[PDB]
Amino acid sequence: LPPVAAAEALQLWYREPANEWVEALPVGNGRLGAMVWGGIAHERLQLNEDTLYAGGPYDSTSPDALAALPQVRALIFAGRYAEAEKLADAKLLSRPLKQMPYQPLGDLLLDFDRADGISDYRRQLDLDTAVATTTFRSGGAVHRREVFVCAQAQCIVVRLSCDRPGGISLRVGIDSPQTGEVTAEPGGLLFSGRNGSFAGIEGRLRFALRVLPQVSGGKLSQVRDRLRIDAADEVVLLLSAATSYQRFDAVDGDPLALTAARLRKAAKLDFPALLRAHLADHQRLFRRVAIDLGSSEAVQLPTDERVQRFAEGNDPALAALYHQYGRYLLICSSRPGTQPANLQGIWNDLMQPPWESKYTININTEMNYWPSEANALHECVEPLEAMLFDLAQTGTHTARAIYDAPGWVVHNNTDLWRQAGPIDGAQWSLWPMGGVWLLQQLWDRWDYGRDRAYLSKVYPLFKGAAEFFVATLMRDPQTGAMVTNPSMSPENQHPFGAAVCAGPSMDAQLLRDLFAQCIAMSKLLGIDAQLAQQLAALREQLPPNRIGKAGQLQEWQQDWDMQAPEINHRHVSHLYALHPSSQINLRDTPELAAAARRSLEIRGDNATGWGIGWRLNLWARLADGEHAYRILQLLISPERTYPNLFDAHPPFQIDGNFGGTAGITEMLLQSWGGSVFLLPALPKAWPRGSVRGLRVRGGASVDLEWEGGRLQQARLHSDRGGRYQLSYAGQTLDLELGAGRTQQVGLNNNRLVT
Amino acid sequence: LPPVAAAEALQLWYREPANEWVEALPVGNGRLGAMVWGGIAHERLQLNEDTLYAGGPYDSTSPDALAALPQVRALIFAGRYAEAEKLADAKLLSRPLKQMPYQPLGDLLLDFDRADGISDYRRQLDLDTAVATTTFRSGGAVHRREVFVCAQAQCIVVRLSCDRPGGISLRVGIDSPQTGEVTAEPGGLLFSGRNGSFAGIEGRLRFALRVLPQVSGGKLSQVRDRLRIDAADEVVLLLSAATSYQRFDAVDGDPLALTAARLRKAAKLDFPALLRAHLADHQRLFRRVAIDLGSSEAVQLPTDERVQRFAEGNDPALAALYHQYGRYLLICSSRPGTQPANLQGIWNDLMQPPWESKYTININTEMNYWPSEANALHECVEPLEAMLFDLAQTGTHTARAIYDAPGWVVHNNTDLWRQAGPIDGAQWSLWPMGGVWLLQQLWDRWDYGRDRAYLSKVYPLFKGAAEFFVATLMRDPQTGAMVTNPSMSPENQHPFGAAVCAGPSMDAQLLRDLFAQCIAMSKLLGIDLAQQLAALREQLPPNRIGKAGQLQEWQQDWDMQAPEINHRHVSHLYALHPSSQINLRDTPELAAAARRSLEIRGDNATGWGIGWRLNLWARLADGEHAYRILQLLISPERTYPNLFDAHPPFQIDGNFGGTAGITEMLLQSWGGSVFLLPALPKAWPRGSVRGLRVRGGASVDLEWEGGRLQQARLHSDRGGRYQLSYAGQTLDLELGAGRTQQVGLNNNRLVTQ
Ligand SMILES: [Ca+2]
Ligand SMILES: [Ca+2]
C-alpha cells in the first residue's frame, strides 16, 4: 500500500479561514460527513448523515394518469406536443409535484476564549489521510485541530492539540435548523429530534446526534446547552449520528441506541489506535490508483490561487489533484451499506437545497458513478445496486399504476423514498429511461469483474426493465419504427413548441444497449432463450441512428437539429452512444462517430459543470487530446470550480467532479470493444507522466508511463487470465495472459511490441 | 451640523469578512458596545456593557502596611532600594495583589439560511453615522445588515434588509462565557445571570441581556434557545443590557427592569425615527470638528491595505481618518453617565484581558482623555470627573489606612470598585501620584471653559490632594528638598537595582502643577491655606540638567547609567507634555534638555509610548520628527486592520494619543498664547481644520497652502484677550463676546483681516 504521490501534491491548503461554505473542506466516511471551516477562535463543523431527508414513505402516483395516457400518446403521434404536455402536467405528473430534499444535521460550534498574536496560519485537507488540519502559532505555542470521519469506528473524530500544557480552553455546542431538543451534561451532548414536512408529505423520521468529550487535564463542566473545558492539555471529541430510516417503506430504526452503541464501542480506544484504523481503511481504497501528470513550482501555491491561475498552463499537477479529488469524494460519499452519492455527495447545509439535492437520473447520478470501475473503486457502486433493487419494487408499482404494464420503470428523478414517477414538469421529466441508464453501471461491474454469481444476481433487474418496454413500445405512424411514447430528449425543446415526442434518439440508444445486454445474459446464463429471441427482433425495429442535413447525428427521429430553439443546449442526450456508451465509436462506426463529432461541434464547449464534464469525456472518446484539454480548462476555472475544488453548476453540484475524474482517465486509458486503447487523447500539456492501478474490462489492471508525448511502457496484469488487445496510435497487439501474470509492452522503432 | 468630510473619506471598509477580533468593527453609545465581524451566513456581534467586571465591592488595604511604612522610607533614604521594594511587596501592597477585570457580556449569533452566489461584498464603518454596514449581492438581490448603538433609546439596533420580498430567513441566538440562563419565546430572548469571582473576590453583580424582534412579513417562531424567522421582508432586532451596579459600594440595581423598560419604550418608534434620533445625537458631537490633510487615490483602497501602504507617502488622508477615529472612539466609549474609557474603551471579548482592561493611571487613562478639550468633546470628560469623585472617598480611606495621613491618594491602577492602593508589584505601582495626574484633566476643563461654578465644584478635590502631600512630603537628608517617599519614576529601573526611590522628577513636576492650581483656585474663589503651599512648592526638587545636557529623571544625575536607556515610559518629560511647565518660549534651556532626553530615549516603544513621543515632538515644534513618529504609530507594527492601536495587543490609549498628537502638530494652546501650525510636516502641504477649541473659551479655524498659513479665524464665545503666534511672530487681539477675527499673511507677516 505505498503512497501514490508526494505529501505536498495531494493536499488542498489555504492561508486564511473559510468565509463561505464553498470554501470549507469536506470529510466523510460514506454516510457521515462534515464541512470544516478552519476558524481560529470560532470554528464551525457542518454535519450530515446521508439518510436525513424530509418527509416519510409516500406514494406520489397520480390516480388520473392511466386514464389520460392514451390521449397523450395519440396527441403526440398527431404532432400536437404542446397539448400533450399540458394534458400530462394536468393528469400524468406525480402528486405532489416534488420529491423530498436532503437536509443538514447540524453544526458543531467550537468557541475558544482567546487567540492572541496569530501567525503562520495554515488550514489543509490531505486526500491521502482524509484529515482536515488547521494549524497556527499563538504566542509561543503551536495550536492544531484535526477532523476526520472513520468508517471503522463510524464516528467523526475531532482532536484539539497544543504543544504547550494547559492551552485548550473552549466551549462546545450544537446549532441546527432541525427541530428537536439538546440535552447537555459534563459527560456529553445529545441532540434528538424529528425531521420536517415538505410538499405536504409530513416528517416521519427521527434522528440523533451525540458528542462525547475525552479530556486530558483541565476541568470538564457544562454550562447551559454547552460543554466547557478550562485549560486542558488535549481534547478529543467523538461524534456519532443516525436516523430511524431502515427502508423506503420502513422507518422503525433506533438512532438513540445506535449512536450510543458506536460511542461506547469507540470510546474504548486510543487516538493513535483510532487514527491507525481510519488510515488503514481509507488508504486501502485511496492508494489503489496513482497518477502523475507533471510537477511545477505552482504546487507551492494555495489551492484557491491555483484555480485562478490554472489557465496559465504552468500547473499540470492541478489536473492530477482534481482527478484524485473525485476518487476521494466518491470514497467519502458512497461506501458499501451507505446511501448513493446524491447531487451533493453527502455534504449539504441547506434545508431546501437546489433541486432537493436528491438523485436526478437523466445524467447526473450516472455521472457520479462513471469513474468507479476504471479508478478501482467498484465497491463504491454497492449503494447504487441497493437503490436499483429498491427501484425494482417501487418502479413495478409505477409501471402498473401509470402504464398498466409489467416490468418496472423509473423516470428522471428519485429520492430516499425511492419514488419512480415523473415530477416537476412534463417538459423535463416525462421520460421512462431512468432505470435503463442506471443499469448500465451494473453491466460495467459485470464486464469489469466477470463475476458469474454477480450476473446471476443482477439479471432479474435487466429482465424486468426489458419486459416493461416489450409491453410499451409502439409502432410509429410517421416513421414505422417501434418507439417510446410518451418520452422526450432530456432536456431539450424540439422545434415544435414542446419537449415531449415519440422515440427520441437517446431512448433508441439506451434500449439498443439494454436489449443487447439481456440477450448476452440469456446466452451466458442459459435461460430465457425465448423472449431473448423476440428482444432481438424488437431490437432491429428501434429507430436507427441517422445523419442529418448538416452531417450531424440526429437528436430526434426527424432531422430537427438545425431548427431547434437552443442550439447550445447543455444536454447532449443523443450523444450517449458515443459516451458513456461505445455503441458509436471511431473504429467500428466511423461515419456515425464523425456525425456525432459534428453534433458536438454544433453544441459548443461551454455549459454547466456537468455539461462541460460530459463534453470532456466525449472529446476523449474522439481521440482529440487538444480539444479535450480545452474542455478541461473550462471545467477547472474560476467560473466552474470553487476554491475548495467543488464543481459548480452553479451552485455546487458534485456531478462535474466525478465526470472530470472520469474524463481525465478516459484521455489516458480507454476500454471498450475487445480492446484497450493507450493514451488515445493525450494533450500536449502532459508530455510526461504515469498512471498506475487503472482497471480495464476483463478483470485486468494497467500501468502506463509516457515521455516526450510518446508512450514509454505499459504493464497489463490479468487476474484470471484471458485474451486482450492493446491499441496505441492505430497499432494493435493481440495478447494472451495467464491468471495472475503481467505482460509489459513498449515501443521499438515506432512499433508496438512486447 | 454640516458634514466634516466626504462620506467615503471617513469610512473603514474591507473586501471580506473579519477572521479575527482585531478585524471586527466597533460601535457603541458610551456604555453599550458591539464588535461587528461582517459574517455572511454566520455573523457574530460581540457585546459589552461598561459596568460588567468580575468580583464585587472589596477593600484591598493591607493591614500590615502602616507599621512597615517608616522602615520602607528609611531604607530608601539609606540607598537600600532593593530591600525597600521587597518589604513593600511583603507588607505594603494590596491584598489581593490584582484588581478586577473587565469582562464581555456575550455574543449575538445571526445564522442565515442562504448565502448563494455571493458577489460585490463590502463591510464598512462610517464614523459620521456610527453604523456598521455589511452589503453583498446574492443572485439578483441585495442583502444589507446594519448595526448601531443609540444613546437616546439606549439600545443596540440591528437591521436586516433585502431589496426583494421575503428574503430574510435566519435564527438568532445568544452565546456567552458568563454564567446564567437564557429563556426563549417568540416574543424575544432574555439572558440573565451573575458575574464570577476573581482573586478571591466573589462576584456580586447581576446582568441582563434582552433581545426584542420586530419582523415585517414572514413567520416568527422560537426553537430551542433561539428565535427563528422564515421569509421575512425586513427584520429589526432591539437589544438592551445592564447590570445591578450602582456605585463602588452599592450593587442593588434592577437590570431586569431597566432592560425591559428601555425595550418597550424604543419599540413604540419606527426605524427611520430610531435612526433619525441616533444620527442627531451622534453627529451633534462628531461633526464639531473637521480636519483635511490632503487626498489621493489611496482613499479608494480598503482600510487594511492602506495601513500596510501608508509608508509609501501617497495617503495623507489616512492620518485624518486616524485622527477622527479617536474622536469617534471617545464618543462611543465615554458619554455622561457612563463609565470612563478603560484600557480597551468598552470593547473586550476576554474574561481575563491583558492587565484586567481596567484603568492604569500612570499614563494610560490620562492619554485616553488628552484629546478631549481641543477636539470639542469636553462632555466626554464627565465619567472621569465622576470617577475622581469616587476616588476622593476610597483614596481617603487608603490615605488614612496606609499612611495615617489626611486627604486622599491613589496609586497607579483602579477598577470598577475604585480601589486606590498599589497592586501587582512595588517596582511598578508604589507611586502616589495617580489622582494628581488625573486632576490635570479637570483643570483643563476649567481652563478651556472658564465655568466658575465648575471650579467651585471641583475645588474640594484639588484641596484634598494637596492636603495629603502636605502631610506626607519629607525632607531629603541627602538633597535637602521636600520629596515623596516612597515613590518611583513609572516604571523605570534606576542604576541601583530597583525602581523605588525618593522624589522622582515626575512627582516634583506633578506637585508643582498641583500646587500652582490650588493657589490659583484660592485666589479665584476667595477661600482658604495657600500661603504654605507656596513655600512648600518652592522646596520641591528643581528641574535639573545633567552631565549629558539631559533633563534628569531622578534627583541625582543617573540618566546615563540606567539599565534600559530606551525605556517605554518618558515620565520625567511630563513637564514638556502634557504639561507646559517646560516649553520652548519660557524655559529655553530646560526645553533643549528635554529634547536631549527624548533623543536619548529614542522613538520606538509601545503604541501609547509612540503616541506620547508624538505629542512631545509636536510641542518642540519639529514637524518632520513628529511625522516620523506618526509613521511609527500608523504602521503594520502598531495598528490593527480595524485601526485599533497595538501595545501589542490592543490598547486604546495609542488611538487617543494619536488623535491628540495630530492635533498638537496643527494647533497648540498654552501659556497665554495660541500657536498656529507649530509642527506642520512637509507631508501635509495644504489642508484645513475647523472647530478646534482653545483655552479661554474660543474656537479656531485654520487653512494652509504651500506649507504656509493661508487664513485663521478666532471666534471668542464671551470675549477676552488672546495672542496668536505663527512661526515666532505674534499678534495681540481683543475680541468681544461672540465675535470672530480673521488673520492671515502679508509679506510673510501675521496680520489681522
Ligand atoms: Ca452516502
Ligand atoms: Ca464607558
CSV table of C-alpha atoms in Angstrom, one decimal, chain B residues 575-744:
chain,number,residue,atom,x,y,z
B,575,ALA,CA,6.6,69.0,32.2
B,576,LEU,CA,7.1,69.4,28.4
B,577,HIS,CA,4.0,67.4,27.6
B,578,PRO,CA,1.2,67.0,28.6
B,579,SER,CA,2.1,69.9,30.9
B,580,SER,CA,3.5,73.2,29.6
B,581,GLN,CA,5.6,73.7,32.8
B,582,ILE,CA,8.6,73.4,30.4
B,583,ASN,CA,8.2,74.9,26.9
B,584,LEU,CA,10.4,76.4,24.1
B,585,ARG,CA,9.4,80.0,24.9
B,586,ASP,CA,9.5,80.4,28.7
B,587,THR,CA,12.2,77.8,29.5
B,588,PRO,CA,14.5,77.5,26.5
B,589,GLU,CA,17.3,75.7,28.3
B,590,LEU,CA,15.1,73.2,30.1
B,591,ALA,CA,13.2,72.6,26.7
B,592,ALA,CA,16.5,71.9,24.9
B,593,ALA,CA,17.4,69.5,27.8
B,594,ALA,CA,14.0,67.7,27.3
B,595,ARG,CA,14.8,67.3,23.6
B,596,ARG,CA,18.2,65.7,24.5
B,597,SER,CA,16.4,63.4,27.0
B,598,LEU,CA,13.9,62.5,24.2
B,599,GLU,CA,16.7,61.9,21.7
B,600,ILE,CA,18.5,59.5,24.1
B,601,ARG,CA,15.3,57.5,24.8
B,602,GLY,CA,14.6,57.0,21.1
B,603,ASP,CA,11.5,56.9,19.0
B,604,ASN,CA,10.3,53.3,19.2
B,605,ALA,CA,8.1,51.9,22.0
B,606,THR,CA,4.6,50.6,22.7
B,607,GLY,CA,1.6,52.1,20.9
B,608,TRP,CA,1.0,54.5,23.7
B,609,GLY,CA,4.7,55.2,24.1
B,610,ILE,CA,4.9,56.3,20.5
B,611,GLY,CA,1.8,58.4,20.9
B,612,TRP,CA,3.4,60.3,23.8
B,613,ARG,CA,6.6,60.9,21.8
B,614,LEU,CA,4.4,62.2,19.0
B,615,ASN,CA,2.9,64.9,21.3
B,616,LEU,CA,6.3,65.7,22.8
B,617,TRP,CA,8.0,66.3,19.4
B,618,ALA,CA,4.9,68.3,18.3
B,619,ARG,CA,5.5,70.6,21.4
B,620,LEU,CA,9.1,71.0,20.3
B,621,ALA,CA,7.8,72.5,17.0
B,622,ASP,CA,9.6,69.8,15.0
B,623,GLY,CA,7.2,68.8,12.3
B,624,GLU,CA,9.5,66.3,10.5
B,625,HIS,CA,10.3,64.4,13.7
B,626,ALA,CA,6.7,64.4,14.7
B,627,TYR,CA,5.8,63.0,11.3
B,628,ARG,CA,8.5,60.3,11.7
B,629,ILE,CA,6.8,59.3,15.0
B,630,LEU,CA,3.4,59.2,13.3
B,631,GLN,CA,4.7,56.8,10.7
B,632,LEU,CA,5.8,54.5,13.6
B,633,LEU,CA,2.3,54.7,15.1
B,634,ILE,CA,0.2,54.3,11.8
B,635,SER,CA,2.1,51.1,10.7
B,636,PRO,CA,1.6,47.4,10.4
B,637,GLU,CA,3.7,47.1,13.6
B,638,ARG,CA,1.4,49.3,15.8
B,639,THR,CA,-2.0,49.4,14.1
B,640,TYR,CA,-4.5,46.6,13.6
B,641,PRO,CA,-6.6,46.3,10.4
B,642,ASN,CA,-9.6,47.9,12.1
B,643,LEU,CA,-7.3,50.9,13.0
B,644,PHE,CA,-7.0,49.8,16.7
B,645,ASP,CA,-3.8,50.8,18.4
B,646,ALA,CA,-1.4,48.0,19.3
B,647,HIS,CA,0.6,47.8,22.5
B,648,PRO,CA,0.6,44.8,21.4
B,649,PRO,CA,-2.1,43.6,22.0
B,650,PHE,CA,-5.0,46.0,21.6
B,651,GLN,CA,-4.8,49.1,23.9
B,652,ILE,CA,-6.9,52.1,23.1
B,653,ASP,CA,-4.5,54.6,24.6
B,654,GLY,CA,-2.5,55.0,21.4
B,655,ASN,CA,-5.5,55.8,19.4
B,656,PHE,CA,-6.3,58.7,21.7
B,657,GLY,CA,-2.7,59.8,21.9
B,658,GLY,CA,-2.5,59.8,18.1
B,659,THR,CA,-5.6,62.0,17.8
B,660,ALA,CA,-4.1,64.3,20.4
B,661,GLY,CA,-0.7,64.4,18.8
B,662,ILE,CA,-2.0,65.2,15.3
B,663,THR,CA,-4.0,68.0,16.9
B,664,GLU,CA,-0.9,69.3,18.7
B,665,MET,CA,1.0,69.4,15.4
B,666,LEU,CA,-1.6,71.7,13.9
B,667,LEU,CA,-2.7,73.9,16.9
B,668,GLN,CA,-1.3,74.4,20.4
B,669,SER,CA,-2.8,76.3,23.3
B,670,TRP,CA,-0.6,77.0,26.4
B,671,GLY,CA,0.9,80.0,28.1
B,672,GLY,CA,-1.2,83.0,27.3
B,673,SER,CA,-1.0,82.2,23.6
B,674,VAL,CA,-2.3,80.2,20.7
B,675,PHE,CA,0.3,78.7,18.3
B,676,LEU,CA,-0.7,78.1,14.7
B,677,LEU,CA,0.8,75.2,12.7
B,678,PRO,CA,3.8,74.8,15.1
B,679,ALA,CA,4.7,71.3,13.9
B,680,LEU,CA,3.5,71.1,10.4
B,681,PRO,CA,5.2,68.4,8.3
B,682,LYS,CA,6.1,68.6,4.6
B,683,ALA,CA,3.7,65.7,4.1
B,684,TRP,CA,0.7,68.0,4.6
B,685,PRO,CA,1.4,70.9,2.3
B,686,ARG,CA,-2.2,72.0,2.1
B,687,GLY,CA,-5.4,71.5,4.1
B,688,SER,CA,-7.7,72.8,6.8
B,689,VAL,CA,-9.1,72.3,10.3
B,690,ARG,CA,-12.1,73.9,11.8
B,691,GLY,CA,-13.9,73.8,15.2
B,692,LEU,CA,-10.9,73.2,17.4
B,693,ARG,CA,-11.1,74.6,20.9
B,694,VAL,CA,-8.5,76.7,22.7
B,695,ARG,CA,-8.2,77.8,26.3
B,696,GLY,CA,-10.1,80.9,27.2
B,697,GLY,CA,-13.5,80.0,25.7
B,698,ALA,CA,-12.6,80.2,22.0
B,699,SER,CA,-12.5,78.2,18.8
B,700,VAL,CA,-10.1,78.3,15.8
B,701,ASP,CA,-10.4,77.6,12.1
B,702,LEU,CA,-7.2,77.1,10.1
B,703,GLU,CA,-6.2,76.8,6.4
B,704,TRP,CA,-2.8,76.4,4.9
B,705,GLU,CA,-1.4,76.0,1.4
B,706,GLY,CA,2.1,75.5,0.1
B,707,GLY,CA,3.2,74.6,3.6
B,708,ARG,CA,2.3,78.1,4.8
B,709,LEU,CA,-0.5,79.6,6.8
B,710,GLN,CA,-3.3,80.9,4.5
B,711,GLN,CA,-6.0,82.0,6.9
B,712,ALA,CA,-7.1,81.6,10.6
B,713,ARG,CA,-10.4,82.5,12.3
B,714,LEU,CA,-10.6,83.0,16.0
B,715,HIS,CA,-14.1,83.1,17.5
B,716,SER,CA,-14.4,84.1,21.2
B,717,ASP,CA,-17.5,82.9,22.9
B,718,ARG,CA,-17.8,85.6,25.6
B,719,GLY,CA,-14.8,87.9,24.8
B,720,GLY,CA,-11.4,88.3,26.2
B,721,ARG,CA,-7.8,88.9,25.1
B,722,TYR,CA,-5.8,86.4,23.1
B,723,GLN,CA,-2.4,86.2,21.4
B,724,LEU,CA,-1.8,84.3,18.2
B,725,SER,CA,1.7,83.1,17.3
B,726,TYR,CA,2.8,81.8,13.9
B,727,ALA,CA,6.5,80.9,13.2
B,728,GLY,CA,7.7,83.2,16.0
B,729,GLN,CA,5.5,86.2,15.0
B,730,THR,CA,2.9,87.3,17.4
B,731,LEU,CA,-0.4,89.3,17.2
B,732,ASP,CA,-2.3,90.6,20.2
B,733,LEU,CA,-6.1,90.6,19.7
B,734,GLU,CA,-9.0,91.6,21.9
B,735,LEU,CA,-12.4,90.1,20.9
B,736,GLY,CA,-15.9,90.9,22.2
B,737,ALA,CA,-18.4,88.3,23.2
B,738,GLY,CA,-19.5,86.2,20.2
B,739,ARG,CA,-17.2,87.9,17.7
B,740,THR,CA,-14.7,86.5,15.1
B,741,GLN,CA,-11.3,87.7,14.0
B,742,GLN,CA,-9.7,86.6,10.7
B,743,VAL,CA,-5.9,86.7,10.4
B,744,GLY,CA,-3.6,86.0,7.6
